[PDB]
């Protein structure tokens, strides 16, 4: 856990980040991102490999199959969902929501993003900017 309450999730979310960056996801981003060390990173990758999630091009890099991008950007919607969430309806302060959907991502449901999608006045871009991937593919 520890706000990287489901590290499958996290580690595809990071490359949806470090691809967003416009940065290359080398395995030292996403240690480091995450604070795993190499040996493990590549451990929960080889891992993730094996589940269809990820794929080791010649560039090394990792990459997201169907799958792994498919797993990435719904839990980008969801935690930009929520960003809307706190702002918008909850009202947490600016500053902390980011650390706060960053774990609420991985527990908030489809059926829970609809009614938000829904009720919240604005879902085109979390508080800070960010597009929200996979509205078309959620179902609203
Ligand atoms: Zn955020
Ligand atoms: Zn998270």
Redesign the pocket.
């Known amino acids: 856990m520890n706000?990287?309450?489901?590290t499958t999730?996290?580690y595809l979310?990071t490359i949806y980040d470090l691809e967003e960056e416009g940065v290359t996801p080398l395995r030292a981003r996403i240690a480091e991102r995450l604070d795993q060390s190499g040996p493990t990173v590549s451990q929960t990758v080889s891992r993730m490999e094996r589940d269809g999630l990820l794929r080791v091009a010649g560039d090394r890099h990792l990459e997201l199959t169907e799958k792994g991008r498919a797993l990435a950007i719904a839990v980008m919607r969801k935690?930009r969902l929520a960003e809307r969430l706190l702002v918008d309806v909850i009202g947490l302060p600016w500053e902390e929501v980011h650390a706060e959907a960053?774990?609420w991502?991985?527990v908030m449901s489809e059926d829970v993003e609809r009614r938000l999608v829904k009720v919240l006045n604005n879902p085109t871009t979390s508080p800070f900017g960010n597009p929200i991937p996979g509205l078309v593919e959620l179902g609203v």
């Open positions: 706000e990287l309450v489901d999730e996290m979310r935690h960053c774990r991502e991985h």
